[PDB]
């Protein structure tokens, strides 16, 4: 389950705000994404995040 993986910033140096499902909190939270090599628990909006991972 990729929804359980911790957020991955990656090697690139941009500061792009994305969402990840935080199973511990039971909600999608924001984190800083570097711009490349995103893993699957990385969404552009909270709605996409809840739809894909909500309740995992």
């Amino acid at each position: 389950d990729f929804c359980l993986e911790p957020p991955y910033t990656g090697p690139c140096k941009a500061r792009i705000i994305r969402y990840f499902y935080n199973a511990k909190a039971g909600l999608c939270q924001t984190f800083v994404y570097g711009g490349c090599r995103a893993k699957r628990n990385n969404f552009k909006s909270a709605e996409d995040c809840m739809r894909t991972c909500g309740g995992a």
């Binding site: 910033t9 090697p11 690139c12 140096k13 941009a14 500061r15 792009i16 705000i17 800083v32 570097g34 711009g35 490349c36 090599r37």
Partner: protein, 222 residues
């Protein structure tokens, strides 16, 4: 920028901020209507902010101009990060002391050349702290071999390393797309690295001198 210093208001006139509701990348003004940044900084709805110092408060020297076109290098590889370069056309030309363009290089810079790297990125190696004002860092260009030793099988002919093997001085998240200026010419674009300011892990930059022909021709036919 980790381990740098406060540049001083508008002392880096070609530095721009790419804003999508907040600062997410830097860029360099090459002429009144064109900006060079990194390909991984591509986003829709980009607003370019020029003449910025404190990115959080309006100080008066600013010019906010939306992008009309964003051209990512045709051979950009999101997996290998090769050809990590992008051109952004401003919807209207900028009014050029606080806002000025930077020259493209005639030749590539050699290892050991001291360069100025700038940005509004994270200033902590372990931790988070984004500055209000523009930060600067003088770092030397490193040899191809040491760069390849630091990142085995990841360095292409289109990338170069710059910084310090000891760690503590580097570009970091939020600096991507920003300039690496040497001898008054734009030699690099902040791109990637393993963490920031680590270590034996210097920052990796897009080698601008290899794209000068492509840049000039692309600007001219768009």
């Amino acid at each position: 920028i980790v381990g740098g210093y406060t540049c001083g208001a508008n002392t880096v006139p070609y530095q721009v901020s790419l804003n999508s509701g907040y600062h997410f990348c830097g860029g360099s003004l090459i002429n009144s209507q064109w900006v060079v940044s990194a390909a991984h900084c591509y986003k829709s709805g980009i607003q370019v902010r020029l003449g910025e110092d404190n990115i959080n408060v309006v100080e008066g020297n600013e010019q906010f101009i939306s992008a009309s076109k964003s051209i990512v290098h045709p051979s950009y590889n999101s997996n290998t990060l090769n050809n990590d370069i992008m051109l952004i056309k401003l919807k209207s030309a900028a009014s050029l002391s606080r806002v000025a363009s930077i020259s493209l290089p005639t030749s590539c810079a050699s290892a050991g050349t001291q360069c100025l790297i700038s940005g509004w990125g994270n200033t902590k190696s372990s931790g988070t702290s984004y500055p209000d004002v523009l930060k600067c860092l003088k770092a030397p260009i490193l040899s191809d071999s040491s760069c390849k030793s630091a990142y085995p099988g990841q360095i292409t002919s289109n990338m170069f390393c710059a910084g310090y093997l000891e760690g503590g001085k580097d570009s970091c998240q939020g600096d991507s797309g920003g300039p690496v200026v040497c001898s008054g010419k734009l030699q690099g674009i902040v791109s990637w690295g393993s963490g920031c300011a680590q270590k034996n892990k210097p920052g990796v930059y897009t080698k601008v001198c290899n794209y000068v022909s492509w840049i000039k021709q692309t600007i001219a036919s768009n």
